[PDB]
Ligand binder design. Structure first.
Ligand SMILES: CCCc1c(C(=O)N2CCC[C@H]([C@H](C)N)C2)[nH]c(C)c1C(C)=O
Length: 103
């Protein structure tokens, strides 16, 4: 699959990016007050990595949905001028541009 070939490329790039540090594992709701209540569908790169390694994606659109969810969740919970928020903006611009550079 050439669709699954690119998400693999773009995920590897997001995983190693400098600004990826808030998105490499799930947010622990025990550690973050309010997170369970505000964020209905948590998402992160390791979860996307797991879903890829298992064959859980069918189309690249499903992959795109999960990527965008990471950044929608980031902007729903974090302030744009917060440390995690700034990192999410850098990561979201990277994803959007890289995704468009292919499709
Ligand atoms: C208060 C900010 C919490 C947060 C992180 C975050 O700090 N992590 C990600 C998981 C563990 C990482 C650790 C340093 N290894 C750090 N990431 C996100 C998306 C959030 C939020 C609330 O949206």
């Amino acid at each position: 699959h050439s669709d699954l070939t690119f998400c693999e490329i773009i995920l590897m790039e997001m995983e190693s990016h400098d600004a990826a540090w808030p998105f490499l594992e799930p947010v622990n709701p025990r550690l973050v007050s309010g997170y369970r209540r505000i964020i209905k569908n948590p998402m992160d790169f390791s979860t996307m990595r797991h879903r890829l390694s298992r064959g859980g994606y069918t189309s690249s659109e499903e992959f795109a949905a999960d990527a965008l969810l990471v950044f929608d969740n980031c902007q729903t919970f974090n302030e744009d001028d917060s440390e995690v928020g700034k990192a999410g903006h850098i990561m979201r611009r990277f994803f959007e541009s890289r995704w468009e550079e292919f499709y």
